[PDB]
Structure formats: C-alpha cells, structure tokens
Amino acid sequence: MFYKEENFKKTEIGEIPEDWEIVELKDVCKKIKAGGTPKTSVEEYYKNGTIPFVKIEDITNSNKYLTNTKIKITEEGLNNSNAWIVPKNSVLFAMYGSIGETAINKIEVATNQAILGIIPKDNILESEFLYYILAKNKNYYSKLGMQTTQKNLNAQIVKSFKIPLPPLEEQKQIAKILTKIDEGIEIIEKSINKLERIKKGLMHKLLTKGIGHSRFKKSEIGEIPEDWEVFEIKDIFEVKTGTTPSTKKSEYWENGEINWITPLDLSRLNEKIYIGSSERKVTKIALEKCNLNLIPKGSIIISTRAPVGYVAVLTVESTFNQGCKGLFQKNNDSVNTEFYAYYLKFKKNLLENLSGGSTFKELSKSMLENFKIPLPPLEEQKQIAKILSSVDKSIELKKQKKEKLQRMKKKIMELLLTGKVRVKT
Numbered sequence: 198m199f200y201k202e203e204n205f206k207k208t209e210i211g212e213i214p215e216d217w218e219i220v221e222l223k224d225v226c227k228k229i230k231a232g233g234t235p236k237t238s239v240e241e242y243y244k245n246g247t248i249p250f251v252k253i254e255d256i257t258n259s260n261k262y263l264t265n266t267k268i269k270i271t272e273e274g275l276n277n278s279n280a281w282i283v284p285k286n287s288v289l290f291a292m293y294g295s296i297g298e299t300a301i302n303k304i305e306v307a308t309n310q311a312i313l314g315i316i317p318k319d320n321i322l323e324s325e326f327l328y329y330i331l332a333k334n335k336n337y338y339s340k341l342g343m344q345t346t347q348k349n350l351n352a353q354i355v356k357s358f359k360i361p362l363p364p365l366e367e368q369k370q371i372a373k374i375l376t377k378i379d380e381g382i383e384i385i386e387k388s389i390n391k392l393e394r395i396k397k398g399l400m401h402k403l404l405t406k407g408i409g410h411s412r413f414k415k416s417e418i419g420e421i422p423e424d425w426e427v428f429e430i431k432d433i434f435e436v437k438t439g440t441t442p443s444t445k446k447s448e449y450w451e452n453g454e455i456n457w458i459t460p461l462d463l464s465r466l467n468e469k470i471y472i473g474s475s476e477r478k479v480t481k482i483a484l485e486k487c488n489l490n491l492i493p494k495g496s497i498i499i500s501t502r503a504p505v506g507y508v509a510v511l512t513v514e515s516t517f518n519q520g521c522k523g524l525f526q527k528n529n530d531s532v533n534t535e536f537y538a539y540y541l542k543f544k545k546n547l548l549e550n551l552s553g554g555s556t557f558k559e560l561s562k563s564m565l566e567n568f569k570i571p572l573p574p575l576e577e578q579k580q581i582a583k584i585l586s587s588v589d590k591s592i593e594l595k596k597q598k599k600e601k602l603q604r605m606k607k608k609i610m611e612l613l614l615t616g617k618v619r620v621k622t
Contacts, residue, residue, distance in 0.1 A: 198620070198621030199619065199620065201618070210361065213616055217361045217363050217616065218362050220359075221358070222355060222358040222359075223356035225317060226317050228314065229315050229316075230352065232280040232311070232312050235275070239274070241271070242270060246268075246271045247272070248272070248275055248306070248307050249265075249270075249305075249306040250266060250268045250269055250307050251289060251309070252312070253295050253312065256295065261301065262300065262302075263300040279310065281314065282305055283302060284305060285302060285303060285305055286324050287324060288300070288317070288331070289301075290315055290350075292350040292352070292355065293311040301325070315327070322362060322368070330614060361614065364622070367622060370620035375613070378602070385599045385602065392592050393592060396585075404540055405421065407573055408584075412424075418570075418571060422573070424577075427570070427571060429566065429569055431566035433532055434527070435525045436524060436565050437490040438490065438519070438523075439519050442479060448480065448486075453477070453480045455478055455491070455514075455515070456516065457477055457478055457517060458472065458515050459476070460504055460521055461503075463508070464504050466507065468542075470538055472498065491515070492517075496523055496526075496534065497523070497524040497538055499524070499541060499560075500560075501552065505552050505558050506541075533578040533579050536573075536581055536582040539582060539586075540570060544568075548560055551564045
C-alpha cells in the first residue's frame with residue numbers, strides 16, 4: 198500500500214515526517230574515508246593489477262552501479278598508498294571533478310583521493326537508499342562555491358551531510374520503487390540507442406544501394422544500383438537565393454504572415470525533416486518590394502552559411518535569407534523531396550568540406566548546383582524515404598516515452614524521499 202495522508206511532521210533539513218530522523222551521514226555510516234593514488238612512477242604498483250582502481254572517470258561512465266575499472270592496482274600499490282579495498286555494495290562519492298557523482302560498486306575496488314568510499318551501518322542505513330538520497334541532492338551538493346568560499350567537498354564535509362533516515366524497511370521499499378523506475382528508463386534508453394544505430398546504417402545502406410536490387414555498377418558517386426542514374430542538382434532542381442529585407446522598415450515585418458526561414462530556424466529543427474514556420478515573418482509588401490524568392494510547399498531548404506548542412510522540407514510556402522538556399526524541382530513528378538533531404542543530410546560532411554574550402558564557410562550556388570546525386574525511379578525514392586522517416590518517427594516516440602518516465606521519476610522521487618507518500622509496512 199501507499200501512505201496517503203502525510204500527518205504532522207518535523208522541519209530541520211526540510212519538511213520531514215514524524216518517523217523520519219534527520220541524522221548525520223557519519224553517524225549512520227561506519228566508514229567514510231577517501232582513497233589514494235600510489236606513486237604512478239612505480240611499475241610494481243600497477244604491473245598486472247588485481248584490485249580495480251577507481252577514478253572519477255570510472256564513476257561517471259557508470260550507470261548507478263560500478264562494475265568496471267579503467268585502471269588496476271596490485272597489493273603493493275594498495276599497501277603503499279592511502280587507497281583501501283572498499284567492500285561490495287558500498288557507495289562511492291566523487292569529491293573533485295564530478296562533484297556529486299555517486300555510485301554503488303558491485304565489485305570490491307579501491308579509489309583515489311578524489312573518490313570517497315562510504316559504508317552504511319548494517320540495518321541502520323541502506324546503500325540503495327543512500328544512493329537515491331545523494332542523487333536528489335547531487336545538484337545542491339555540487340554547489341559549494343557560488344555560496345561564499347569556493348570549496349569542492351572534503352571527506353569531513355560529506356560526513357556532516359544531514360540526510361533523512363526512515364525505518365529500515367521503508368528505505369528498502371522506497372529504494373525498490375526508484376530502482377524499478379530507473380530500470381525502465383534504462384530499457385527504453387537501450388532501444389533508443391539501438392534504433393539510432395539501425396537508422397545510421399539504413400541511411401548509408403539505402404542511400405547507396407537502394408532497396409530491392411541485385412545488380413549494381415560503378416559511378417561517379419560510387420557503387421550504385423544498376424537502375425539508378427546520376428545527375429547534378431542543377432539537372433533536377435532549380436537553386437534559389439534569399440535575402441534579408443532592411444530591418445529599418447517595419448512595412449516589411451509588422452504583422453508579417455509569410456515565412457522567412459533563417460539557418461537559425463533550421464538548426465532548431467533538431468534533425469526534424471519538416472519545417473512549416475519561421476521565427477520571424479515578412480509581409481506581402483516586403484515580398485514584392487524586395488523581390489524575395491518564394492518557394493512552394495514540398496521544396497527543400499538548406500543552410501549555406503553559419504551552421505552549414507542543415508536541411509529541411511517546407512510544409513508551407515516560404516522565403517528565406519542569404520543564410521539559406523532553396524531547391525525547387527523542375528517537375529514534381531519525377532522527384533520526392535524527402536528522399537533528397539535525407540540524401541543531403543547523409544552528405545552533410547561532403548557539403549561542409551565544399552564550403553569550408555576557405556575562411557567564412559559558405560556553400561556557393563555553383564557548389565550546390567554541381568553537387569552530384571542519384572536519380573532512382575520515383576517509387577523507390579518514396580519507399581526509401583518512407584522507411585527513413587518512419588524510423589525517425591519511432592526514435593522520437595521512444596525519446597518522448599523516456600522523457601515522461603524521467604519526469605515521473607523526478608516527481609515520485611521527490612514525494613518518497615520526503616514526507617508525502619510512504620510504503621505500507
């Protein structure tokens with residue numbers, strides 16, 4: 198069950214419930230000492246080590262539990278330094294570098310003077326509970342300089358940390374809940390990373406070998422399907438240029454309703470393929486007076502200045518500044534813009550070099566025009582683009598599921614670690 202009512206409560210290190218007892222980390226832990234670094238100049242201290250030596254890095258590169266070590270140390274190195282074999286299921290706390298970064302070592306390890314080996318008193322304080330506690334106040338802990346005297350964290354300072362100490366049974370309960378949440382977030386995060394890997398492989402595969410082919414040939418753009426041809430952007434698209442109507446005239450921006458896309462609007466896309474709105478808009482007067490190029494919906498827009506290589510497909514007609522270039526197809530019956538938007542993202546590094554051919558990176562109109570591209574049959578272009586865009590969508594739905602779970606953890610974590618909700622026992 199879940200204790201709904203909060204009843205009355207104390208108030209020392211914050212609103213704490215009756216049962217809770219604000220205790221000092223040192224009073225509930227049987228050992229809070231820092232590690233040490235054996236004379237790195239001595240080979241006999243590391244030469245074929247058996248004791249995993251933990252550094253600030255090892256903790257940061259660990260997800261809650263520490264099970265791997267980058268470097269090792271032997272008995273001699275150990276005995277000839279301030280490092281000590283920390284018992285399993287303990288809690289490591291980084292005092293320098295990554296202030297607040299905590300973890301639970303699953304294997305006996307040693308640490309340098311940066312990491313702090315902490316051992317909770319048996320049946321007095323759970324390591325699991327301690328982990329989630331030091332995590333909730335991780336940001337608050339790291340903040341120990343902007344206050345007055347900038348100081349990282351001393352072994353004596355951490356020992357004086359005032360943390361809430363609920364019944365041993367509740368500590369296991371609360372920690373079990375947060376542990377389940379964390380595992381969920383881990384499962385989703387693993388599918389996201391794998392799907393992003395598949396997506397990357399699909400980009401290379403599909404855009405070079407297409408789909409459904411068994412015959413290929415050489416070409417100016419490498420091995421490609423036999424049914425595919427090669428051309429230049431100029432051959433299939435018309436390249437349009439943009440401009441920025443004087444900022445001195447309101448007649449150009451006041452209540453603007455025509456999109457005016459800048460490379461900044463594109464960078465904010467976050468890999469999204471479609472763009473249907475711009476931060477700042479221009480008016481019909483600006484369009485005719487400044488003779489801006491208006492490209493229809495379905496056109497391709499790409500940044501040629503500043504962050505070069507950002508590409509999108511317009512969902513609504515729009516104009517754009519000199520920081521971009523537009524691509525309009527000769528006939529919208531032999532080309533799918535989404536496919537080419539993807540092809541261009543795929544060749545971002547290539548476009549980046551063409552422009553970086555000097556100071557002030559700019560992708561000239563000739564550069565874009567002469568850029569070589571594949572020309573698959575319209576139908577295959579739709580197929581390859583449906584696949585790429587459907588996977589991109591899947592990745593996004595997953596990231597959104599992770600986000601809601603991470604927010605939910607942040608919520609529940611706030612309620613359980615305090616006097617709000619509790620477990621039945």
